[PDB]
Fold this sequence. Notes:
alpha/beta; six-stranded parallel β-sheet; Rossmann fold; binds thymidine-5'-diphosphate; UDPGT_MGT-like (chains A, B); Glycosyltransferase_28 (chains A, B); globular
Amino acid sequence: MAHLLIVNVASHGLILPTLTVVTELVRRGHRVSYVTAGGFAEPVRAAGATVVPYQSEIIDADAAEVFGSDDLGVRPHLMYLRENVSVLRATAEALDGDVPDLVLYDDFPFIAGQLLAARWRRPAVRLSAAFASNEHYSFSQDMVTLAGTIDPLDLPVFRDTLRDLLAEHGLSRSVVDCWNHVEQLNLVFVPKAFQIAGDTFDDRFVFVGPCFDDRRFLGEWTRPADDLPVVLVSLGTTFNDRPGFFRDCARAFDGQPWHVVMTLGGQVDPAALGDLPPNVEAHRWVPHVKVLEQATVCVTHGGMGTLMEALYWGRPLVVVPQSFDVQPMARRVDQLGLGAVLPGEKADGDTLLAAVGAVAADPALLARVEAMRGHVRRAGGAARAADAVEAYLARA
Amino acid sequence: MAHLLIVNVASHGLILPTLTVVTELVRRGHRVSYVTAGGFAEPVRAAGATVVPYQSEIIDADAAEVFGSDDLGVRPHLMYLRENVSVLRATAEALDGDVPDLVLYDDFPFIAGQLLAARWRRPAVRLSAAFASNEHYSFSQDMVTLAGTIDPLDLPVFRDTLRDLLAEHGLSRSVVDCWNHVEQLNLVFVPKAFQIAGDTFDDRFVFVGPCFDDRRFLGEWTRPADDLPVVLVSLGTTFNDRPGFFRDCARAFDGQPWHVVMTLGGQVDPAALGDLPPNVEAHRWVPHVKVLEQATVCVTHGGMGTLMEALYWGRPLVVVPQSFDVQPMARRVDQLGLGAVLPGEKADGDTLLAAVGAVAADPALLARVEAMRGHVRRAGGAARAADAVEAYLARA
Ligand SMILES: Cc1cn([C@H]2C[C@H](O)[C@@H](COP(=O)(O)OP(=O)(O)O)O2)c(=O)[nH]c1=O
Ligand SMILES: Cc1cn([C@H]2C[C@H](O)[C@@H](COP(=O)(O)OP(=O)(O)O)O2)c(=O)[nH]c1=O
């Protein structure tokens, strides 16, 4: 009954929750256009969607290095607008003659998303792979706050670039109303129980939780031979250039009654770690969902995708936040008592060893992890998202 | 001519900026009721207002301890409501028979403010002694994020109490709408230029900047006989139980080309510092406003009052934040290049000494500070506040 456009940027965290949703909507006779770049085109086409390529900077940008350049975060902010503009121009060109009935856009390209919907006079849907935002809670604000950057709107060049962009595309919305625009429908990839201030989000928000595959394109992983409890250890895909962290982890678990699956996420080359104990392994990539299924503890920097996949299986958590983008999750896990949180420096090998053992042996924590798993399960998934999408089409 | 009620709580930072404003309205003939507790009654009467006492909990509470109690911040949050409720009941008791034409309330007692405005069906005005909040920026969220506490609306007992309070008081305004309510007029004691995301604030907000007196009731001060550049050092009135800080600073400035004036703020006894060099003073209280007039550098934790009082006199800053509450102001001062910031531990006497000398000798920084001084002067202060109120009073 529809041609659905998904507006997104080139990032694992933002695309992976989307895949099984695409496959479900397509299963129901809908047709999907998907904005993406580079190697992401491959899994996106496999989910059933037609790929609309665009030129991305962020795809091979070094996050740590970008946020390091200057002390106000001008470089991050301006790259943000560029990625949005690059996405806006490429989608319009491709689909100006094939107008979608429904524009769905991730938080990141939300400027391009609003402008596209306005340009075509089409209903819109927002997708959140992290925490959702409303009048009470802004995932964006405490992003700025924690990151230490300048407010984007306090940055004259950013503000003017945006004002000229809205003006050009004639969107009848002011810069501030645009930046703080709440969409009529929002698909969020966490349970409401986990969402910060989740009790405050109304009907416009649908908390469907993690949506995932076997994800064979991230490789495959098979239960070990030593039959030791399995600990997943990963720093994600973004701020993951930390051979020190991984090497110290391998050392601490050397001879310990655990089997460690280490995930480098594309930065550190396994070889750069040197030799690992027999109970410790390291990959550029393995499907977290595949390790976590057989796992006992999950050690993660706090990436949402990894947290929700771990909680899906009721795995006690050890969160090792190394960057700002992940701190709200880590704060939320700590306050829900879903695991131990070792922020930055504190996440050394030895401390990480005591934490892994501690949370694996805590009956009260395990009581909370099991219950939360229950909310994740009773959360929609790809099926409930597609339902919302189809009900939304109806009202339009 | 009117009866103006000022709803406030027993706190120096929240009451000081209000005083000269009261005196102006009264001077113009209006009659002012002022909600306060304890020893603040004296200065408030002086300003020319009629004191409405309420039983206060925060007036004799130790912030550091209160926030140290538990890991979620349940004790602070619940005290916050009690303070609000205690203020609600007292004022209602006193003014039910003497309804005000206008209800002016500070951010803190904003819940009691809204309910009183609704009860009596009167226009209301909000007062912000720190940054103001709107749809783009929330000082509150910034606070919770920085303090590491749970969102108050994620805390059942807190929201239930709030919900019931709103219901029992007839207010037809949901808990979340209530919490994120934007008043139709806001007096903000900050220049819009300093305000975070100032450009995003509309005409509902009037940035009148600092409003102060001789403040003789805080004692007096005559510049030294040694004729050294005077440096004001102060950790404020809230998280100021830090003898090590003042002790180490006095030690560092020993025999240095500066005259250090330290204010303990009713916490540490001056005697507990022990012997001080001839060029270092220590007081329970002296009017920052009088030191700052003769000063060369202001060293402060980031209290909004001290900051604005210093910028009023174009004084270079060394910001030494030791607590979440002054963290956004330290961030802002740093972004505007108005001074050096030495967060928490970084703030030893030796590093403080270099900073003081450094900010005093930076031509660029001084250009920026002198310019901000310009904005503070343009703000309009007490006169402009009464102007706004009177216009609001006539419109409604
Ligand atoms: C690094 C890595 C991530 N993932 C998945 C898990 C998450 O759903 C998603 C995003 O990674 P995540 O760890 O959440 O990191 P980031 O903070 O960078 O987004 O990618 C893997 O499956 N295998 C891997 O090796
Ligand atoms: C401690 C102290 C404060 N003040 C004034 C300056 C401010 O306007 C007001 C509040 O103090 P401030 O320094 O801003 O601290 P806080 O963050 O704790 O509120 O008190 C004095 O005049 N003298 C003093 O000795």
